[PDB]
């Protein structure tokens, strides 16, 4: 289909309790495939999907080395950010980084990313051109200046257009059993009395992969966007995801309500109703 590879990184300082903890995970679409945690007894990059286990020892050494180097790098960067924002050294702070690529079904680059956040706020992002920077404030403009001087964007672009795309493609082939299978949601509607006067209709989608899905209720064919409780898509623990949407319905109106499900494993959008 269309696919993506993303690496996520979080460093959290903890002054007085040792060096910052560095956790990083890699995904292809919504499948976790590698993880590194600096608090593990023996930190290595570890496999988390079967189709990556076949990579040889040299893969694991190289990936592990990169993780360890970025763990140290983040530690220097967290000390720099204390200077840039004129902060005391007594508090815990967060530095997050995300990078990766999106490809279309033909396997071509649709979009690259490389972005950082500090204390949960955007700091600096590689723009979609993969050549210019968006700095969120005057602290990040100092980074931008250093990165412009060092032609950093050029190096990121080469990774994003080259290795990012080529290895994602390799992974998509090696994990073609799972990564290129969409599991359609299993859908039903349940009925939950609140009082004599109304009841909740809850439309469920279960066992679906990937996570992207649309779940919508209408009444007499009109979207009930403001009266729908839509819960955040959540993992089941078995690779698949779950989601429901609920509306409060006055007694006897149930058949005026229809639930609408769009998902990539469904050849056509579903329509369902409560069935007493």
């Amino acid at each position: 289909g269309s696919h993506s590879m993303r690496y996520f990184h979080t460093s959290v300082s903890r002054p007085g309790r040792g060096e910052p903890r560095f956790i990083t995970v890699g995904y292809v679409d919504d499948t976790l495939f590698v993880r590194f945690d600096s608090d593990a007894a023996s930190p290595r990059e570890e496999p988390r999907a079967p189709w990556i286990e076949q990579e040889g020892p040299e893969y694991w050494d190289r990936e592990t080395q990169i993780c360890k180097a970025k763990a140290q790098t983040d530690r220097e960067d967290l000390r720099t950010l204390l200077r840039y924002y004129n902060q005391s050294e007594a508090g815990s702070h967060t530095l997050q980084n995300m990078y990766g690529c999106d490809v279309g079904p033909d396997g071509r680059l649709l979009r690259g990313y490389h972005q950082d956040a500090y204390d949960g706020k955007d700091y600096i992002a590689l723009n979609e051109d993969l050549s210019s920077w968006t700095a969120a404030d005057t602290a990040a403009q100092i980074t931008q200046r250093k990165w412009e001087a060092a032609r950093v964007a050029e190096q990121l672009r080469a990774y994003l257009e080259g290795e990012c795309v080529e290895w994602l493609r390799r992974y998509l082939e090696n994990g073609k059993e799972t990564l290129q299978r969409a599991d359609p949601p299993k859908t039903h509607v349940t009925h939950h009395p609140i009082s004599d006067h109304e009841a909740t209709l809850r439309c469920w989608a279960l066992g679906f992969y990937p996570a992207e899905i649309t779940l919508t209720w209408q009444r007499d064919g009109e979207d009930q966007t403001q009266d729908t409780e839509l819960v955040e898509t959540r993992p089941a623990g078995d690779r698949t995801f779950q989601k429901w949407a609920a509306v409060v319905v006055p007694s006897g109106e149930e058949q005026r309500y229809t639930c609408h499900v769009q998902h990539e494993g469904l050849p056509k959008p579903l329509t369902l109703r409560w069935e007493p």
């Binding site: 690496y7 890699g26 490389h114 700091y123 600096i124 190096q155 990774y159 990012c164």
Partner: peptide, 9 residues
């Protein structure tokens, strides 16, 4: 496969 490039803030 990860980015092997490091760039300090």
């Amino acid at each position: 496969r990860r980015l092997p490039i490091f760039s300090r803030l």
